[PDB]
Design a protein around this ligand. Structure first.
Ligand SMILES: [Zn+2]
Lengths: 165, 350, 377, 108, 54
RNA sequence: GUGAACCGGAGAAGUCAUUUAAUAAGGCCACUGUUAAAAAGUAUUCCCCACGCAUGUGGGG
């Protein structure tokens, strides 16, 4: 896609003031506070009116908030299941590993509205283990096409491939 | 050229061609349609009963050479079938098991006299009675009269003029197509060969059912040299249309201006110079919309409308500003925008 | 004539039914994962409650000899009671335990008076207790759930004659399914040592599992079967129907309730009289998803009303219509979105709903059918 | 589910009572739509109704079982029933594009 | 003349046909396993019914 | 009318009981938004229609 790449580049073009504006609004909707709505509209609407396959409003809002609180540099080949597999194959397999596995597996039963907080938990686990990179574009596409079966199959397959190295 | 052979396609979700080893309770398919099986299908096509067929119609029909090509060789599935005696008189229940061939396809070629083949093909286009595959609980999934006849040659040549149909893109295929053919006389090899098996599928009578042995030979075929792989038609996977609206193609850019002239440059609810257009019914987008699907609005009212339908879960029927039920919420959102917006942020972002 | 009850309920975070692994019971419906309460849980939790106390005329146990022993006040005949029961046909499964027998609490006196009798033998004693067991099918709970008692015969010496021990059920309870997708969650607990001085440290994180869901519940009672099951008592059948409705409205399965305490109430009860049974579970093949402003219960009731209207307009026949009442607590949740009303009544009190149901069924009154009292104990 | 009825065989079975044959066809059309198997319905109570019935008249017999050669996968803006009906519609469209005319129009 | 009837019917979690073991009856089609209600079960429900008796 | 036709694997069942994730931490040190303007002493006001045509009067968007 190209709307996603432009959206991510625009998000990384922000400075500390607008990042703080987005950071103050975690856990909130889009139609609540005017400064957040204005910032997100001015960042997203030209891309939507240009590219027909730009990310939807809810997905783009969720990625904007996650980037605000969990600022990671954009890199290719650093998807969420790969990093979760790399982290998960370092703990004992009796107590901690089933807990982290259950936390990762909760995401399959949630829709796109109720997914900011588990993703925040996963990214907090990533940040606790000295991670400084993430693939925002691939995560945005996966969240955009989520209720399908092949996307979840590829998600779990990438997790298994990272876990069984 | 007069037709010589006749083609029959036998394919269904379930089918079963019984064999002689089914004697008491367990009923087994052999591997493929038998001569007696297909010559009950042809008899039921021309409406010949169980009587009056043995003396006249069966001897002429049994004077044929037929061969079966097998694709999707089928997976045998067993069924626990109970027959309730009572509901002699007893409350007993009889148990049995019946075998079916799941996901199978067979191509039968019957070669013989021309006008007999023409009569058979004319009968198959509108059968007199119901046509099934072995047992009455198994209807075909593809039409039996699907391939045209012709003045072909011996059965190996007749089993090569039909393409191998597929169903979806990644459909796995076999490299080998086994085929089962009737043995052929000719007085050079007058005695039966070593690799010939014996099948009990030569029908004589049907009401006191009578079958006779028939020598059966086996051969093979390879895809790409004898049969050419065909392709599926139509669309299998069904998806809703769900056309995401586009604001860059020419058709929408002209429809939007036409709507902006239909309403005389005035926002609908607050009556200010309109600068944008908001959709109501979304099931026309992509460049096919009508001017009655669109409503003219200004920046403040369209921002209020966008706020009012962010996470409301509306798929095709969005907010209609002309509706007098949405007036209060739009006015309240407009008041909030007027009270809390900052022009400096928007001017700085662009 | 069939009386059907469709209920919409929403439950607090709890665990009302668990499998062998402890996780809450789930199922698959519409290609997505739901949450399930098994039908045998609902039936047991309804029939064992403070609202069904007067009609608990049945018992289900393997220790019938213990019942015989406790029915008397002496040293009794406990060993030969078990020997007689072994002679009956309730043989030990792999030389262990017994077979479940459902029987009325009334006829145990006949068992006590027959087994203790010394003017007979073991074979005649076994035949007599079999005869009195086969004629213990008069109880309100046995008239709904139904019975099927069949010995394995491995111990049938062609000396004990058996009879029609099967009772056709009158009540069909469906498995409760959630109206939305299922979101299970894990509660993490640590048992704390009361002594302040531990002088040790080790992780002992436990694992408990719970979930919250909006359940759709479906019941069905055959009125003509209940008359035959209760031999022709209209008053007892009406009392059982009313008490079952009142119990099902205000009871919950007593699962992990001392730690979760999720005694919630239904937000909608629709009672319909029909000629053929119909289930409205197809309303929720599309799962209910929350939006910017919505109750989960309001959206579920709206989907139910949409499908009910579609079925009523689609499967309509003037030979046998359907008339139904819709109950919500003080009309909190109307059937629909204040549009396309279908229900012939709108009750706002549960007692009035049960009274109207009884009035349509036989013209009885709830204060009138309470006089038909079964075994209480 | 698929059903077939032979009109000529039924008429010969009734030897000419065409009104009785029509009444039996109507009775079966009602019964096969509003009857369910009795297996374990006292514990599960799956008294559901058809979500669409298509009655067709044609010369050769056929079954639209090849429509669901791909298992139905559910998406966000659909349920299982609508997608099954959509696949049936696509197969009917393909069949009427391929097998039609020949002085024999089909009726749905 | 050949009247054909096609139906699409979604069912609640149930067990309408059984093997000799107790599982629901299944079959194979398209590369997966599919739940199946047998032909002779459906014919027995249509026959001997109160609708077909009235 | 096809080892085929005719054909239910059916009746039945609470996984219930017990449990704090607890004890602790400053996000700290530095930064002009600067340089500019008559809503008015003009020389064509963006379009249509009545009249006789001395840098002509009336009427309507
Ligand atoms: Zn406006």
């Amino acid at each position: 896609n190209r709307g996603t790449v432009d959206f991510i580049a625009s998000l990384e073009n922000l400075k500390e003031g607008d990042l703080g504006i987005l950071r103050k609004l975690r856990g909130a909707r889009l139609d609540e506070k005017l400064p957040g709505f204005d910032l997100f509209s001015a960042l997203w609407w030209p891309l939507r009116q240009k590219n027909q396959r730009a990310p939807k409003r809810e997905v783009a809002w969720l990625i904007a908030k996650l980037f605000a609180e969990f600022r990671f540099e954009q890199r290719e080949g650093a998807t969420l299941p790969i990093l979760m597999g790399g982290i998960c194959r370092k703990l004992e397999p009796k107590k901690e590993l089933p807990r982290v596995l259950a936390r990762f597996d909760q995401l399959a039963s949630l829709d796109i509205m109720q997914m900011e907080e588990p993703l925040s938990v996963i990214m907090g686990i990533l940040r606790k283990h000295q991670q400084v990179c993430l693939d925002w574009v691939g995560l945005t596409d996966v969240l955009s096409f989520w209720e399908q079966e092949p996307v979840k199959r590829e998600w779990s397959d990438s997790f298994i491939k990272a876990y069984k190295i | 050229a007069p037709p010589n052979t006749l083609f029959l396609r036998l394919e269904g979700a379930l089918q079963s061609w019984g064999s002689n080893e089914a004697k008491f309770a367990l009923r087994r398919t052999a591997d493929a349609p038998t001569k007696s099986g297909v010559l009950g299908l042809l008899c039921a096509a021309m409406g010949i009963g169980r009587a009056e067929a043995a003396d006249s119609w069966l001897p002429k029909l049994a004077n044929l050479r037929m061969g079966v090509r097998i694709d999707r060789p089928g997976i045998r599935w067993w069924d626990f079938h109970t027959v309730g005696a009572g509901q002699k008189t007893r409350a007993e229940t009889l148990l049995s098991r019946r075998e079916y061939l799941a996901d199978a396809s067979f191509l039968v070629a019957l070669q013989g006299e021309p006008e007999l083949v023409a009569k058979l093909s004319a009968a198959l286009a509108k059968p007199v009675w119901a046509i099934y595959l072995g047992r009455k609980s198994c209807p075909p999934s593809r039409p039996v009269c699907e391939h045209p006849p012709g003045f072909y040659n011996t059965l190996e040549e007749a089993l090569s003029a039909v393409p191998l149909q597929k169903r979806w893109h990644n459909e796995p295929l076999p490299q080998i197509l086994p085929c089962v053919m009737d043995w052929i006389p000719g007085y050079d090899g007058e005695h039966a060969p070593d690799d010939a098996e014996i099948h009990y599928d030569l029908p004589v009578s049907f009401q006191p059912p009578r079958h006779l042995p028939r020598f059966v030979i086996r051969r093979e075929l390879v895809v790409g040299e004898d049969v050419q792989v065909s392709r599926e038609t139509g669309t299998s996977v069904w998806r809703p249309k769900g056309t995401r609206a586009d604001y860059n193609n020419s058709e929408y850019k002209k429809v939007r201006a036409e709507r902006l002239v239909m309403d005389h440059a005035a926002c609908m609810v607050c009556k200010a110079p309109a600068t944008t257009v908001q959709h109501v019914n979304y099931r026309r987008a992509g460049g096919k919309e009508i001017p009655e699907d669109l409503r003219a609005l200004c920046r403040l009212c369209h921002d209020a409308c966008t706020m009012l339908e962010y996470g409301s879960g509306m798929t095709t029927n969005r907010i209609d500003p002309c509706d007098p039920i949405w007036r209060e919420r739009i006015l309240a959102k407009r008041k909030e925008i007027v009270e809390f917006r900052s022009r400096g942020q928007r001017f700085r972002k662009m | 004539m069939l009386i059907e009850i469709h209920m919409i309920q929403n439950h607090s975070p709890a665990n009302l039914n668990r499998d062998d692994l402890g996780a809450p019971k789930t199922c698959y419906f519409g290609g997505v994962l739901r949450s399930r309460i098994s039908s045998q849980c609902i039936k047991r939790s309804i029939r064992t409650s403070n609202d069904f106390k007067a009609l608990l005329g049945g018992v289900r146990t393997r220790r019938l000899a213990d019942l015989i022993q406790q029915e008397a006040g002496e040293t009794e005949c406990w060993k030969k009671a078990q020997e007689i029961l072994n002679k009956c046909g309730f043989k030990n499964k792999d030389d262990n335990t017994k077979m479940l027998v459902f029987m009325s609490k009334d006829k145990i006196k006949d068992l006590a008076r027959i087994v203790l009798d010394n003017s007979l033998g073991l074979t005649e004693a076994a035949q007599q207790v079999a005869n009195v067991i086969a004629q213990a099918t008069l109880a309100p709970d046995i008239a709904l759930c139904g019975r099927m008692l069949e010995p394995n015969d491995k111990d049938k010496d062609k000396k004990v004659k058996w009879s029609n021990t099967t009772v056709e059920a009158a009540l069909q309870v469906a498995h409760a399914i959630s109206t939305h997708i299922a979101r299970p969650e894990i509660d993490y607990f640590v048992a704390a040592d009361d002594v302040p001085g531990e002088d040790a440290g080790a992780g002992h994180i436990g694992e408990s599992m719970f979930a919250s869901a909006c359940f759709y519940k479906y019941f069905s009672i055959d009125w003509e079967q209940l008359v035959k099951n209760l031999k022709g008592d209209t008053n007892l059948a009406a009392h059982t129907v009313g008490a079952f409705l009142l119990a099902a409205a205000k009871t919950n399965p007593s699962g992990k309730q001392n730690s979760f305490a999720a005694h919630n109430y239904p937000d909608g009860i629709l009672v319909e009289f029909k000629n053929s049974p119909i289930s409205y579970a197809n309303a929720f093949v599309r799962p209910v998803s929350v939006v910017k402003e919505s109750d989960l219960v309001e959206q579920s009731i709206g989907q139910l009303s949409n499908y009910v209207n579609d079925i009523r307009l689609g499967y309509y026949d003037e030979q046998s219509p359907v008339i139904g009442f819709w109950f919500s607590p003080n009309n909190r949740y109307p059937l629909g979105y204040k549009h396309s009303k279908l229900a012939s009544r709108n009750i706002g009190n549960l007692n009035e709903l049960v009274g109207a149901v009884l009035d349509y069924i036989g013209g009885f009154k709830w204060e009138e059918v309470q006089k038909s009292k079964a075994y209480i104990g």
